[model samples]
Target chain A: DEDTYYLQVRGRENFEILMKLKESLELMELVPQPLVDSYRQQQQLLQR
Target chain B: DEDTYYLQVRGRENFEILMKLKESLELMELVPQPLVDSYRQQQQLLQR
Candidate 1:
């Protein structure tokens, strides 16, 4: 019973998070990989 | 024409990566959040 309950809850939460992540990503403007890489590099530099 | 070309390529590539990420997550066995948290913690430790 406990195992079943855990699986049910975990699966629901995982599905919801994935759905939201997908939705958010799709809603964003499609920037190129180069732009993403550049931003990440800039962040790393700023953090340093 | 060049702007259209960039948008078309970036959009297709982004869509494909998103689809693959979604499909990969769906294919994973439903592990509980606790287990996921533990594994992620271990990974973070290893990285550090």
Candidate 2:
């Protein structure tokens, strides 16, 4: 799967970048708020 | 700014999705190999 391959390759940096991009999109209201909320929860889990 | 905002919001889901996209890009060779390698290391740190 792409997710596993990405995890095996450059998951962290890309995730950081993705997080940043998502924020920008949110500010612009490009993505749904619920999606952003869900994403955040995932980050917290990964943090610990 | 955006990073923090994203972290506060839905970071994990977005990151996971981002990781998947990056992998697909790598398989397609759309992104440079070095970039992919750097991203993988970041994911490892977050995993532990």
Candidate 3:
């Protein structure tokens, strides 16, 4: 099967980069649930 | 400061959301360096 995955980071600056995109998407009202879920997963991973 | 972060998923659907946005941004000729860099950074994290 083809590869599938997400981005991950455990730092203020690192997260902000994505957060910025998230915010932009929010402003555009295009926050896809699947993408939202993926980022959430990464957040949990970082806590470990 | 308020906390900030990103969305994370390891699936084609997940990236498409942002990639869609990325493509839109590119079409508009306005891909922000910081935002793009953040996505790249997370990509590296996923491979680890």
Candidate 4:
């Protein structure tokens, strides 16, 4: 169910897209604060 | 020049965070349109 939607939206290709987006944004120092907060939370989640 | 800041803000660790963030957001169907646009542009840049 959700995997179907997830695959449609964020398959391997999209993951790469996100990675490249991250790279470009990081280079430009343009990553939004909300994304930074989300990223931090995700890191914390991983640690637990 | 920028590598100093880039490393501080988005080194390997932050990249992993962004990857997790992408996975989480994609699963939640919350990937923002601005990010989507940026991703597309990055993909295009890769092709060129």
Candidate 5:
């Protein structure tokens, strides 16, 4: 995780922050869609 | 300051659904022994 992980992101407002967290977790950084999808799911769940 | 954060556990008993994570963190109550001991250990180390 980066320094941005501590930031307040709401309703995907900090989409970049989501990207950053996924990038760090990506053993598949070369192929980015799966990681992005994972991030989207998490964000949606947060809204619920 | 150390008590700045805490988990507010609620309707989290898996509701008859198996929380298959051996001990999935359900929204809260008395924490498990392993977690409580680990938490206390962390507090001890960090406190020192």
Candidate 6:
């Protein structure tokens, strides 16, 4: 586990900022997975 | 030589969370040991 985690409040921009990070996924393990899965699902819908 | 440090804040309530992650390490070879020892002791007393 990454025992050290960081939190920053971006308010309305939070979800989108998080989603962008998920798309590239550099530190995948460091991120919360549920948020990643949700982003992936939405990205798939955009493909069709 | 590799090391990392982090900070955690604790609370008692309906929820608790970890926030703010930053890391730093002592460069012992560069600094006088006496200063570090004294600094650390004072820092420890400040922690509560």
Clashes of 4: 0
lDDT of 5 by residue, A1-48 (tens): 443233333345244544554564554555578787887777556432
**lDDT score, candidate 1, position A18:** 43
Superior candidate under lDDT, 1 versus 2: 2
Which 10 consecutive positions of candidate 5 chain A have the poorest summed lDDT? A2-11
In model 1, the runs with Cα more than 4 Å from the true position are A1-11, A30-41, A44-48, B1-10, B30-44
Q: Interface RMSD computed for candidate 2 is what? A: 13.2
Give the CAPRI rating of model 5.
incorrect
**Candidate 4 overall lDDT versus native:** 0.50
Query: Tens digit of lDDT per residue, candidate 5, span B1-48?
Result: 643233332245422222322233342345767888886676566422
Top model number, DockQ: 2
- From the highest DockQ down, the ranking of the candidates is 2, 4, 3, 1, 6, 5
* lDDT score, candidate 5, position B4: 29
Q: On a 0 to 1 DockQ scale, where is model 6?
A: 0.03
Q: Considering only chain B, report the TM-score of model 3.
A: 0.35
> Once model 3 is optimally superposed onto the true structure by TM-score, how far is the C-alpha of residue B16 displaced, in angstroms?
1.1
Q: What value does the lDDT take at residue A2 in candidate 2?
A: 18
Which residue pairs overlap in candidate 4's backbone?
none
Writing each residue's lDDT as its tens digit, candidate 2 over B1-48 gives 211121333345544655565566345456677897998889878865
Q: lDDT winner among the candidates?
A: 2
lDDT of 4 by residue, A1-48 (tens): 421121223588877776554444433333455765676575556542
Model 1 lDDT, full chain set: 0.48
Off by over 4 Å in 4: A1-30, A46-48, B1-31, B46-48
Ranking, lDDT, top scorer first: 2, 3, 4, 1, 5, 6
